[PDB]
Amino acid sequence: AVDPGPELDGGDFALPEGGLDDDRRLRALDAVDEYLTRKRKHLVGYQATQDMQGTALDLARFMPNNINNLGDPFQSGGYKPNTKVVERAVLDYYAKLWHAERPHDPADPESYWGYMLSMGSTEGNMYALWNARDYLSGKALIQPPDRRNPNAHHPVAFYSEDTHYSFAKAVAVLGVETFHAVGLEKYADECPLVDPVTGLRTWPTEVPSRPGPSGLSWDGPGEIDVDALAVLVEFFAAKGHPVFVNLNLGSTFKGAHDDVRAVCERLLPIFERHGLVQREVVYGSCPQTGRPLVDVRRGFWIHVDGALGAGYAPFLRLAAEDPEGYGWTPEAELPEFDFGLRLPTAGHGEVDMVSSIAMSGHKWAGAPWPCGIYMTKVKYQISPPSQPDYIGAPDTTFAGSRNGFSPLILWDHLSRYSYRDQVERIREAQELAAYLERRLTAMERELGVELWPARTPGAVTVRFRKPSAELVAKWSLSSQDVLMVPGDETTRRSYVHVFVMPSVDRAKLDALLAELAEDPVILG
Amino acid sequence: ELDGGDFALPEGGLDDDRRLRALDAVDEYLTRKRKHLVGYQATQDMQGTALDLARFMPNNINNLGDPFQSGGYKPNTKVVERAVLDYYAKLWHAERPHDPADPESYWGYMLSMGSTEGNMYALWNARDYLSGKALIQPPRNPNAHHPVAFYSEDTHYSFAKAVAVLGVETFHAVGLEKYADECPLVDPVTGLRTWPTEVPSRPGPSGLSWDGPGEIDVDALAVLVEFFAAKGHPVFVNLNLGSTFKGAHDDVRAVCERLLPIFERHGLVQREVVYGSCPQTGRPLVDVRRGFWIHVDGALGAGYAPFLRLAAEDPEGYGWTPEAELPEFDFGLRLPTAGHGEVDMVSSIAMSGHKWAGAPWPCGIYMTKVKYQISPPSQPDYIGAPDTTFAGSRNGFSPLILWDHLSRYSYRDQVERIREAQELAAYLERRLTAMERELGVELWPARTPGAVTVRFRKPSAELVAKWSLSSQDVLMVPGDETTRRSYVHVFVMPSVDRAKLDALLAELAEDPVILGAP
Ligand SMILES: *[C@H](NCCCSC)c1c(COP(=O)(O)O)cnc(C)c1O
Numbered sequence A: 001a002v003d004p005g006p007e008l009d010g011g012d013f014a015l016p017e018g019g020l021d022d023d024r025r026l027r028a029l030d031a032v033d034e035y036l037t038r039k040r041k042h043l044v045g046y047q048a049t050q051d052m053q054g055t056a057l058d059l060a061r062f063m064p065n066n067i068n069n070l071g072d073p074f075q076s077g078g079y080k081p082n083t084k085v086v087e088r089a090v091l092d093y094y095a096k097l098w099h100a101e102r103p104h105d106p107a108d109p110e111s112y113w114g115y116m117l118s119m120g121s122t123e124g125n126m127y128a129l130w131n132a133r134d135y136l137s138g139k140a141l142i143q144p145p146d147r148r149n150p151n152a153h154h155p156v157a158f159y160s161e162d163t164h165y166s167f168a169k170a171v172a173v174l175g176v177e178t179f180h181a182v183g184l185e186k187y188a189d190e191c192p193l194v195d196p197v198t199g200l201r202t203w204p205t206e207v208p209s210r211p212g213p214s215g216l217s218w219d220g221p222g223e224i225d226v227d228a229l230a231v232l233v234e235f236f237a238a239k240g241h242p243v244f245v246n247l248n249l250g251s252t253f254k255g256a257h258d259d260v261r262a263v264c265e266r267l268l269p270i271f272e273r274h275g276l277v278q279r280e281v282v283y284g285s286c287p288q289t290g291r292p293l294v295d296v297r298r299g300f301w302i303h304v305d306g307a308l309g310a311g312y313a314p315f316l317r318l319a320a321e322d323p324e325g326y327g328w329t330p331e332a333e334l335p336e337f338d339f340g341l342r343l344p345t346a347g348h349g350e351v352d353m354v355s356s357i358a359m360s361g362h363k364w365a366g367a368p369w370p371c372g373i374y375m376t377k378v379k380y381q382i383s384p385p386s387q388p389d390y391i392g393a394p395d396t397t398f399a400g401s402r403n404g405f406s407p408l409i410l411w412d413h414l415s416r417y418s419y420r421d422q423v424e425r426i427r428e429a430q431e432l433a434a435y436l437e438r439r440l441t442a443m444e445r446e447l448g449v450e451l452w453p454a455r456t457p458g459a460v461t462v463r464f465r466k467p468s469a470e471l472v473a474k475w476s477l478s479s480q481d482v483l484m485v486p487g488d489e490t491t492r493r494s495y496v497h498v499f500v501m502p503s504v505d506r507a508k509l510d511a512l513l514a515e516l517a518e519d520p521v522i523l524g
Numbered sequence B: 001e002l003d004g005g006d007f008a009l010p011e012g013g014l015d016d017d018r019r020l021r022a023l024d025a026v027d028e029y030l031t032r033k034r035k036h037l038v039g040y041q042a043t044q045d046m047q048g049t050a051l052d053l054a055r056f057m058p059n060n061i062n063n064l065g066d067p068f069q070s071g072g073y074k075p076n077t078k079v080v081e082r083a084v085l086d087y088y089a090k091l092w093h094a095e096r097p098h099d100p101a102d103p104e105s106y107w108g109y110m111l112s113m114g115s116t117e118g119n120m121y122a123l124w125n126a127r128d129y130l131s132g133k134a135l136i137q138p139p140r141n142p143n144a145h146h147p148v149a150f151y152s153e154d155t156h157y158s159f160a161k162a163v164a165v166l167g168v169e170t171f172h173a174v175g176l177e178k179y180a181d182e183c184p185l186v187d188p189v190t191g192l193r194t195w196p197t198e199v200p201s202r203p204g205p206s207g208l209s210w211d212g213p214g215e216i217d218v219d220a221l222a223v224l225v226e227f228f229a230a231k232g233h234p235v236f237v238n239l240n241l242g243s244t245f246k247g248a249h250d251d252v253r254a255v256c257e258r259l260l261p262i263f264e265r266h267g268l269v270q271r272e273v274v275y276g277s278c279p280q281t282g283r284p285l286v287d288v289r290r291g292f293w294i295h296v297d298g299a300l301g302a303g304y305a306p307f308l309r310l311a312a313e314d315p316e317g318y319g320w321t322p323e324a325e326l327p328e329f330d331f332g333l334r335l336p337t338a339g340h341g342e343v344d345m346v347s348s349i350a351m352s353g354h355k356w357a358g359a360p361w362p363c364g365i366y367m368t369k370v371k372y373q374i375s376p377p378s379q380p381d382y383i384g385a386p387d388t389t390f391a392g393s394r395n396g397f398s399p400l401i402l403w404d405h406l407s408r409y410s411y412r413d414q415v416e417r418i419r420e421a422q423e424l425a426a427y428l429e430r431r432l433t434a435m436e437r438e439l440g441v442e443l444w445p446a447r448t449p450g451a452v453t454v455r456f457r458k459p460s461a462e463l464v465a466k467w468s469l470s471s472q473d474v475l476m477v478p479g480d481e482t483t484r485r486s487y488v489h490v491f492v493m494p495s496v497d498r499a500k501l502d503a504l505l506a507e508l509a510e511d512p513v514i515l516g517a518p
């Protein structure tokens, strides 16, 4: 019978024609503050860091400015109250962190390009799939054949069943076809995978994730099944389709890390066998006698959805390579995932495997609103829509007006912490997630109750049985239902999770655990 | 100017002195530029909101999911968001409250980008709705599911991006592909029946659109829409309410009056829609929908036009009669049908919060009605809501910014804001023409009646950079590179007062490009 506290009352905020006087205004803002303050100090169920504080002190002075980073980060524009100099410094930091080639240089196809997002990673995943759709479908690139094969400009998208819902939305928005939709449409009877529940060759809706003790993915780690991916990708690559793969680096519910290096090692030979490392691409034509114009491109695009994990994984991997220097050996290996991942081929030399990465600033770093980064390389940049106006190609971003306050937030954050400090943040979170799992299993033994605790090795989240609605509301626990046998509603379990972000300390977890021990749903 | 060296972020971090010196540099730059900005449609003054709202910066606010549903992320401002949406719903004569059971009630949400997101969402929502994809509440023509998009040549570049992103085909692309020799318009320069790339805007003294007002040519739109409607296509029309360069207002009521008879003739008001087919032997489940969608891009103008129209309706009561008439554009626009019923003509509206109101970052509103909401992709999912929003995580600070703003000003104060801007825009245009006579030079001043922007000849790069003047080149004869002209404009936003304009004009009068004459 615990109290989450009162929610905000709509009548306090109704905006009348005549305006509100200063007393009613302050009362309403105080109510918002008291609400937000209580909720932020108890939030443990979402992958969003809640303590910034130094940031507010450093950056409140900028609130009077209508800052607008309209246009490309690397180009001057007319709207002078912008922070593009700060944006570039942040992008440069992450470029180095993710082993991209810097500085950005439009003359160097291998150098990075990216920009800070005005939404969260939803914007970065949309941009990634937009950029990949056009690149793989043969639209024109920024400056510096597909003969016969009718599938050459029909890209197929692959991602695991732990992929965030934003991807399904982005696929629908951009008209990108998933392997499931193309399989059902064109190849209805040819699914190369056997369903482990039914035994039938039915196209799964997403690439299977790895099984747990059950034999099915519901209690698995949440990592993509690399074997199954390879079977699916080979099938579609053999038919002549170009290939888009999204890999999750810190999945939404289980905090899993898809094994990016293993995926790439497994797929590269498939891409080489089916002519997808280098292929000539017809992009339109100009009318005379012979029609098409042609350039050379890769026929695959691997994107890393690092909304969460691109913020901490580089730091964990720093510790893994020098465990003595940082005083910490991480328990789990996190796979190589970034722009430095290169593999040798049979006959194209070393291939740099990853094409893009997104990250959310409001997840690991923390911010007062959604923000983040999309990064790729110059060689992937698409030519924007033409016009009789001139002056570079400033609009090569998803947003038009762009948030120039977000650069400040993340610049301020990154300036305050060294690499060593960032390693300690991921260390403390990893150790606290392990602690939480230990305490939950001890609770089961102390009380004689089932909590179903689960933690993927290397994840900063632990899942367990959903407690009462009031406890869930007090601590902002994110919920997920799973069916333990797909398509059977009698096997439903309700889970919550806790994300151990850097603002979650031992005291917080202990306070949650103590209420959990007396919760009426948990006690049963 | 800001030196990159001062902002580089080393592996080791920056100490407190270095951090502060960098933030001081940013503040000194921004402050100087914000105080002189007059060339973009962005209100620069909101120091009241800084004092009110700085306190919330410690919170990672997230309005994940639908604004009208609870969710698990408790640090959210959805109650505030709804209050802001309700204000604009009333202002735009939408039906409130939002109610999923009332198809005519509004639905909208606050954007995490600017109007780019709202225009993208509108075109996504219209593409799915017009192409027959499944709705939330629904309890032989081969072109029936091929919508065609129409908008003027003054349409913001965000639309061209949105069209590309969503795979929506414009009338130009469909014309070229399917109907290459059948363009119903003649080009005024060539005399050939060439498909124009966008719907013509109205001509100026030149006989061409470059010196026109920037409003869509209603005749031409009607001709083009008729053509594609006759062939069975459903129709999307974007109308600009405060165009980007000229600040023009497309005559939404005139458009609607002109198009409705076309929609009724070709069965687009009530069209049978094949949205799928059942598990039993292939027969369709069918819904009745309209086959047209009119969206108002009010990025700028949806924030002031309701207040100008208030004064127009009661000019004695507000002590002001606006010199130009702004068209009825909103969800209250209803026309009589052939059968003496009524039809509500507008489907959606976008507005930017960082334009007329002002904000520290991009934000805004998308609003439509319950009857147009699309069914999301099917999956047993985690919490936000059965949502239908573009953004995933959503900015929950922007509701506070706009709520704070709206609570400070009555309708009468809002009317005064748009009055002062209209009168100052007229003043600027007078001063520029006086300056041409005083100095004996051509400034090409132009102002669309009713617009809060004035265009003129581009001055020196130094002056442009000091006052953040937005620039645009025009070809005075399309395709001929030798007829290029360089314009700037000034946007008279509420933060632009007479003193600011007089300081600008005094510098313009001594500017070497302006004095350097033809
Ligand atoms: C984010 N999921 C949880 C969002 C709320 S807690 C901050 C997420 C996204 C979408 O990112 P936003 O647009 O930033 O919500 C995309 N991919 C993954 C793996 C995510 O966790």
Ligand SMILES: *[C@H](NCCCSC)c1c(COP(=O)(O)O)cnc(C)c1O
Pocket: A068, A070, A399, A400, A401, A402, B040, B041, B042, B113, B114, B115, B116, B117, B119, B156, B158, B240, B242, B243, B244, B297, B299, B300, B352, B354, B355, B362
């Ligand atoms: C905004 N155009 C001018 C640049 C912004 S100065 C504040 C604009 C858009 C796109 O809106 P944002 O995404 O908010 O830039 C769309 N339509 C029109 C008519 C606009 O003026």
